[PDB]
Amino acid sequence: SPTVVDAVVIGAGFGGIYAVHKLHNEQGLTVVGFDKADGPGGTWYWNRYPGALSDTESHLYRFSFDRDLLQDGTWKTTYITQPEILEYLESVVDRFDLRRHFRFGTEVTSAIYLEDENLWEVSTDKGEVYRAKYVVNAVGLLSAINFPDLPGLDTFEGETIHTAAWPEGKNLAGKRVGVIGTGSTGQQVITALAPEVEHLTVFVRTPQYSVPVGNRPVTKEQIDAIKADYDGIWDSVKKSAVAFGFEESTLPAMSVSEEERNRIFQEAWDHGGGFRFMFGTFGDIATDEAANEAAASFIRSKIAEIIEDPETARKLMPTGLYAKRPLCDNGYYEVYNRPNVEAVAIKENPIREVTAKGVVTEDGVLHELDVLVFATGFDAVDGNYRRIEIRGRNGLHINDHWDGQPTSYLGVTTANFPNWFMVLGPNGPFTNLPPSIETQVEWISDTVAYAERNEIRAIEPTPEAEEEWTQTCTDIANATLFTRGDSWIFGANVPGKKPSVLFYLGGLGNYRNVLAGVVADSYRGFELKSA
Numbered sequence: 001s002p003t004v005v006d007a008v009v010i011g012a013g014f015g016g017i018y019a020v021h022k023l024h025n026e027q028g029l030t031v032v033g034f035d036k037a038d039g040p041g042g043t044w045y046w047n048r049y050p051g052a053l054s055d056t057e058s059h060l061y062r063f064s065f066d067r068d069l070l071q072d073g074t075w076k077t078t079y080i081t082q083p084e085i086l087e088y089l090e091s092v093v094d095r096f097d098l099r100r101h102f103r104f105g106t107e108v109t110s111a112i113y114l115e116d117e118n119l120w121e122v123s124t125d126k127g128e129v130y131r132a133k134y135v136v137n138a139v140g141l142l143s144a145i146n147f148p149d150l151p152g153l154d155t156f157e158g159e160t161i162h163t164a165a166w167p168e169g170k171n172l173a174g175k176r177v178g179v180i181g182t183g184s185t186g187q188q189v190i191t192a193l194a195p196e197v198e199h200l201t202v203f204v205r206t207p208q209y210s211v212p213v214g215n216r217p218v219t220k221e222q223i224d225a226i227k228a229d230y231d232g233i234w235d236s237v238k239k240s241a242v243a244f245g246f247e248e249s250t251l252p253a254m255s256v257s258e259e260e261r262n263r264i265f266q267e268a269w270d271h272g273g274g275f276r277f278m279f280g281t282f283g284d285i286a287t288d289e290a291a292n293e294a295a296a297s298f299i300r301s302k303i304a305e306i307i308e309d310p311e312t313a314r315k316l317m318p319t320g321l322y323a324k325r326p327l328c329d330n331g332y333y334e335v336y337n338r339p340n341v342e343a344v345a346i347k348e349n350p351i352r353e354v355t356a357k358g359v360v361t362e363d364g365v366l367h368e369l370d371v372l373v374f375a376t377g378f379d380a381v382d383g384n385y386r387r388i389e390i391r392g393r394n395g396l397h398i399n400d401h402w403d404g405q406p407t408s409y410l411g412v413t414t415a416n417f418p419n420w421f422m423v424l425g426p427n428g429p430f431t432n433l434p435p436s437i438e439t440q441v442e443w444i445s446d447t448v449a450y451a452e453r454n455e456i457r458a459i460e461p462t463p464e465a466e467e468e469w470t471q472t473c474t475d476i477a478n479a480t481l482f483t484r485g486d487s488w489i490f491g492a493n494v495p496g497k498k499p500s501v502l503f504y505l506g507g508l509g510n511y512r513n514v515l516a517g518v519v520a521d522s523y524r525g526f527e528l529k530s531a
């Protein structure tokens with residue numbers, strides 16, 4: 001005796017919160033949501049590591065769809081910490097009475113399409129079964145935990161924390177900590193842990209490029225000036241490419257004098273923001289090799305000013321293309337001048353084994369550790385889809401459908417899987433994410449309503465349309481240097497995972513233009529089954 005509902009939503013982050021609001025409050029459908037978390041927040045429920053903070057400016061790292069909720073927003077700094085975002089997202093849940101629609105502490109273990117009924121059968125880890133005509137997957141593009149295995153790790157004194165599963169209230173003051181990982185998460189937790197711990201050991205494998213964040217206090221008059229121009233601010237954001245609120249440059253870097261190139265880089269550096277350094281200074285830093293090297297070397301010279309010990313600056317000096325997700329920090333490079341901060345270059349002096357009481361290097365040197373923080377990445381974009389049994393038409397598994405690379409049509413849809421939608425699924429926009437999540441959930445909500453109104457019982461894309469979208473994303477990505485960034489953005493960070501394109505990099509405005517032309521062209525690329 002399964003529970004019948006119109007729509008199932010998986011995940012209670014940004015995407016699920018909004019999807020439950022659109023499907024129930026606006027369209028009046030019966031909806032059930034799920035999250036293995038005990039409450040809402042998604043990313044910001046799980047990542048409670050110290051230093052966790054958004055690189056989207058405070059006034060734009062939030063929903064834009066409700067004007068009253070925009071005029072009630074509050075914040076203290078130019079950027080916003082994890083406890084502030086979790087609080088904001090919880091406030092959205094109470095504001096729209098969404099809580100009662102969500103089954104928390106529950107994991108969706110299977111999602112099986114029943115063709116003869118045109119219904120999805122969704123079963124959970126608690127034993128309950130549901131049947132729905134629509135399924136909306138908001139399972140998170142940076143959500144499936146990546147946890148590398150090390151020799152003898154099952155045999156260790158003390159705790160092993162992956163940053164995306166940090167226990168609330170855990171403080172490491174006065175302890176002896178090691179951190180592995182030098183991406184955005186590692187930098188934040190290294191910078192936050194340095195003043196409190198008595199010895200920090202950073203196992204650095206690939207040092208990265210990072211600019212100052214510039215997180216400045218915000219006055220009431222500043223907030224009010226933003227609130228009285230919210231419409232135009234969001235209008236410009238949604239028409240732009242990366243949607244961070246700053247003017248995106250079209251000036252080629254090597255077309256100006258060396259002094260002007262320096263002046264522009266130094267202005268962004270002093271202002272702050274990783275995305276602004278990459279896209280707000282010149283227009284070809286991500287597509288022109290000479291422009292990219294000008295940006296990379298300017299950052300290197302700054303790191304050489306900061307880190308006094310030249311041998312310490314050597315291990316932390318980033319080489320190669322400036323083509324990973326732009327990073328910014330609250331004083332990351334100054335940490336290594338502290339006497340109680342050690343850097344270990346893992347590529348020269350590798351990790352050999354985890355002992356009972358610490359980590360041994362091929363140094364013939366053990367580093368004792370009360371705690372070992374894992375600042376490693378995510379099985380990004382497609383990870384949380386491959387972890388569960390998703391079968392569509394003819395019972396074809398999602399892993400067999402996504403045999404090689406994960407694919408979509410327009411980032412929100414895939415073939416053989418009718419009435420089945422993805423928020424931040426494969427081959428979607430690469431922007432400030434809340435306004436791209438809103439764009440997707442809005443199109444998904446409008447597409448369900450169109451099915452309900454015109455009596456369609458199954459919508460799904462054609463293989464021809466899906467392959468056309470893959471090619472469109474592949475051609476655009478091949479015009480950039482991100483394809484050679486060697487990061488999670490192209491699926492190169494998980495061993496066993498085959499690299500591929502994973503993002504449409506045409507920008508949010510072009511993406512929204514593509515979605516609107518698809519709808520106006522009577523859902524071009526979509527097969528409709530009626531009656």
Ligand SMILES: Cc1cc2nc3c(=O)[nH]c(=O)nc-3n(C[C@H](O)[C@H](O)[C@H](O)COP(=O)(O)OP(=O)(O)OC[C@H]3O[C@@H](n4cnc5c(N)ncnc54)[C@H](O)[C@@H]3O)c2cc1C
Binds near residue numbers: 014052108
């Ligand atoms: C530390 C950090 C900082 C970031 N900073 C920024 C930033 O400044 N700007 C920006 O644009 N983006 C940022 N991001 C990225 C992005 O904005 C967030 O990941 C965003 O909140 C995604 O929202 P979501 O709802 O799509 O997914 P998530 O927040 O990841 O929510 C997915 C949810 O689905 C649940 N789930 C998955 N599978 C199942 C299942 N089988 N059953 C039940 N529940 C399931 C998970 O528990 C999770 O709670 C950051 C990400 C991280 C990790």
Ligand SMILES: NC(=O)c1ccc[n+]([C@@H]2O[C@H](COP(=O)([O-])OP(=O)(O)OC[C@H]3O[C@@H](n4cnc5c(N)ncnc54)[C@H](OP(=O)(O)O)[C@@H]3O)[C@@H](O)[C@H]2O)c1
Binds near residue numbers: 148181488
């Ligand atoms: N906006 C924000 O402030 C913010 C903050 C945190 C996260 N994020 C988002 O989340 C993404 C991922 O961030 P993240 O830093 O958690 O992930 P990440 O970019 O994948 O970083 C993983 C780190 O772990 C290292 N590592 C991986 N496997 C290892 C192994 N087997 N042994 C040793 N070291 C290993 C990596 O080194 P290698 O490079 O050598 O592989 C890297 O330094 C970011 O790009 C960003 O989109 C955003």
